[PDB]
Amino acid sequence: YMGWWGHMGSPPQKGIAGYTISPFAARPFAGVVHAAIFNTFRRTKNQALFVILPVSFFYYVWTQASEKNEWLYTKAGRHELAKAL
């Protein structure tokens, strides 16, 4: 499923013209400030829910479990601990 240079296995290409300029002719950091602020904000905004939802849910689960565990091993939690075991 992959060939090599000259016969990579692409369907025939026709009609595309590609253009680029030399690394020495270009400013490598052109538009860096705009990218760093606006591009990163857009990319992050669009992915935020996919991180926030699972992280927040599992953090809540952990928080509840660890708080209960702490409470069960206090004096106040004696009776509830006795039942739990």
Binding site: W4, M8, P54, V55, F57, F58, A65, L72
Partner: protein
């Protein structure tokens, strides 16, 4: 014809590191492969060096590690580099496996590099487990004991096998000397399998974040990915530096600075952090043999991803529901990790069982269902 192409030896290097045709759009998650190669090289260099100063005999082992720390020039560095790189090796391998699962790298035509990969992961676990025993501190001894008794769960011959792996009736000098020899060997085996999974990959080439063919648009591996790999090499070395020089013991257990004592069992025996999720899965099943099966199955189940993923599309970039499911799967794997190091107490017992069920149901139920539904949504949605 250029020498790099003409000469058969040079041509093999050329095909992997120079002329190798890569997708032009690999993102930074494609950099863990080279980080894993870096960890392997650091572990070989530091490991062989430690072997020049370490004594595998149980009467001298712990002391030989102290001699390395205290007397050998830069021995402290070589020791801490070796110990911390073992952790970084697992961070990079989990990232690499995470990348592979998210982007569907396990799908045809890359089932074989993925399946060899699963074996590499098992070899890393065994390598790291045996290396940890070599210190012969309290965590070393008891770690060996407990893990080498998982073989007792095997019916009939199980106990005989345990004594065979110990070279006696308990973990002792025979076990330590054999773990040294095997710890030395295993990284070479691991390097061979790492080479095999690359050769297997070379038939399809790298996948890419869009999940489409890159045959239309290829970039040479050098100089583009060479120089892109340097960025993460230096980011890695920064992380390495902060641990090795400023916090060398953050990832370790203080009890491993106590010499092994077969009588006293330490208050809490937990594995190294990177094994913690598998230990939580084992605790979840009350039965001995049940627990062992579950724990091994948790790794071997990765081999069925090619089958249970029913999607007509490779990878999760364009699959919102699959992305949510993947997020929950990863966070559950981290919760299992955390539960691996809590005390066996309420309510963590039941929580560990729920997280274990979720772990397996990802492979067996959710991914097959979600991938089926998304297929239908793509078709109806674009009509």
């Amino acid at each position: 014809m250029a020498l790099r192409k003409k000469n058969s030896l040079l041509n093999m290097a050329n095909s992997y590191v120079l002329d190798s045709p890569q997708p032009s759009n690999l993102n930074y998650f494609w950099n863990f492969g080279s980080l894993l190669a870096l960890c392997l090289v650091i572990q070989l260099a530091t490991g062989i060096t430690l072997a020049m100063h370490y004594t595998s005999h149980a009467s001298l082992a712990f002391d030989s590690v102290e001699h390395i720390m205290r007397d050998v020039n830069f021995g402290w560095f070589i020791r801490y580099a070796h110990a911390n790189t073992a952790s970084f090796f697992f961070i990079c391998i989990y990232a690499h496996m995470g990348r592979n699962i998210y982007y569907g790298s396990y799908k045809t035509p890359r089932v074989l590099p993925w399946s060899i990969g699963v074996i590499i992961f098992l070899l890393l676990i065994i390598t790291a487990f045996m290396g940890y025993v070599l210190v012969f501190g309290q965590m070393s001894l008891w770690g060996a004991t407990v893990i080498c008794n998982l073989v007792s769960a095997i019916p009939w011959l199980g106990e005989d096998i345990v004594h065979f792996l110990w070279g006696g009736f308990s973990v002792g000098n025979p076990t330590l000397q054999r773990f040294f020899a095997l710890h030395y060997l295993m990284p070479f085996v691991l390097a061979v399998f790492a080479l095999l999974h690359l050769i297997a990959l070379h038939t399809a080439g790298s996948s890419n974040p869009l999940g489409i063919t890159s045959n239309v648009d290829k970039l040479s591996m050098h100089p583009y990915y060479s120089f892109k790999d340097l960025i993460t090499v230096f980011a890695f070395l920064l992380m390495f530096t902060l641990f090795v020089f400023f916090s060398p013991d953050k990832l370790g257990h203080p009890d491993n600075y106590i010499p092994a004592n077969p009588m006293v069992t330490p208050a809490s025996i937990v594995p190294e952090w990177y094994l913690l999720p598998f230990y939580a899965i084992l605790r979840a099943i009350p039965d001995k043999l049940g627990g062992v099966i579950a724990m091994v199955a948790a790794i071997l189940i990765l081999l069925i991803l090619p089958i249970v993923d029913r999607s007509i599309i490779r990878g999760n970039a364009f699959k919102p529901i699959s992305k949510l499911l993947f997020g929950f799967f990863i966070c559950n794997f981290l919760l299992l990790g955390v539960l691996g190091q809590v005390h066996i107490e309420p309510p963590f017992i039941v929580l560990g069982q729920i997280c274990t069920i979720f772990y397996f149901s990802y492979f067996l139920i959710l991914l097959p269902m979600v991938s089926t539904i998304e297929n239908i949504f793509f078709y109806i949605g674009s009509l």
